[PDB]
Amino acid sequence: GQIKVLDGEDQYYKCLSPGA
Amino acid sequence: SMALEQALQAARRGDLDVLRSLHAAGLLDSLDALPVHHAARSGKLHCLRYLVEEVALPAVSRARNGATPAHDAAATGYLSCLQWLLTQGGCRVQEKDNSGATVLHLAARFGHPDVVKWLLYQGGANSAITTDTGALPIHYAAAKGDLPSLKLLVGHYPEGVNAQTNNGATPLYLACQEGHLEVTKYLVQECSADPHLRAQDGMTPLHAAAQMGHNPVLVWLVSFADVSFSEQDHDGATAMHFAASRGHTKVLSWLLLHGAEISQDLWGGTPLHDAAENGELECCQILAVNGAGLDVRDHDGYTAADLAEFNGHTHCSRYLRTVQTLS
């Protein structure tokens, strides 16, 4: 089976804190 | 583009002095965000206010994905900047980005209980709204593991407790998949979350915990939540299949020590077939020592050593074939 995700691979919100 | 980089950095550092400098010089990115976006990004309320009121930059601009500055402030959790944007600023709390996410989704997605608590009770935010994937704010708080945010969301919108995303995940499924045990206990004990509500592929929250190796969650569920480790997905795969197939020796061993059987799925494959097919040597050995039948054939006629051989896993094949010629 696959893992269930809520969002796509877009990085706009993840790459908003200094975590990218 | 010298102006862009300086404005974005001064806005992000909190440098009011540079901002009023650029501005007075009449100088006021690749994702289409603005300095209002960068101010909101790390809670520089003074720079953000100056950016909108004094320099008249709109605060309703949308980045490529439809993120306005208020979405930015909610994701990063800077409540004071979000308040100013919604009240004085000109942002409206029901605004959606191009994925359907409002500021309350983001606030839940990145775990900021204060931003969530304000949005629900003073902000007018709707907690019944889904993104395009079908996610409620409660789905984000559970997946994030944010139990304070989740608590607020259960109280505000209790019908979300058993709601399913478009691919069938409940908040419990997501908590179990992500290994958040405190959230998992709270949904089951206190909110009567159904633990048998399956995703679209037939997986239960028990399988999600087994698949991702979250033994603490799996143990609680099996012991205290009326879930049996004989649970099966639509292919007859058990928690032990998912653990073996993804190399989770801890889950696999716990299952085997507390009595779970080593069974074939609907296709005749045992958790050893799955371990061998994915080249999980340690799981192959744990299963072999716990008496898995090495010569059991699936519906295609293959033993576990066969599948390991076909998928290039030579140490798995070597081991299983030699353990069998030992007998």
Author numbering:
A (entry chain B): 1288 to 1307
B (entry chain A): 0 to 27, 33 to 331
Manuscript text:
The THDI mediates binding of Myo3 to its cargo protein Espin1 (Ectoplasmic specialization protein 1) and allows Myo3 to transport Espin1 to the tips of actin bundle-based structures such as filopodia and stereocilia. The high resolution crystal structures of each of the two binding sequences from Myo3b in complex with Espin1-AR not only reveal the molecular basis governing the specific interaction between Myo3 and Espin1, but also allow us to discern the Myo3-mediated release of the auto-inhibition mechanism of Espin1.
Comparing the structures of Espin1-AR in complex with Myo3b-ARB1 and Myo3b-ARB2, the ‘YY’ motif and the ‘KxL’ motif are essentially in the same places. First of all, the C-terminal α-helix of ARB2 is shorter. The interaction is mediated by a hydrogen bond between Asp1294 and Tyr144, instead of the more extensive interaction observed in Myo3b-ARB1 complex. Moreover, the positively charged residues in the N-terminus of ARB2 cannot be reliably built, probably due to the high salt concentration in the crystallization buffer (1.6 M ammonium sulfate). Indeed, substitutions of these positively charged residues with Ala weakened the binding. Furthermore, the involvement of more positively charged residues of ARB2 may compensate for the less extensive interaction in its shorter C-terminal helix, thus resulting in a similar binding affinity to Espin1-AR as ARB1 does (107 nM for ARB1 vs 53 nM for ARB2, Figure 1C2 and C3).
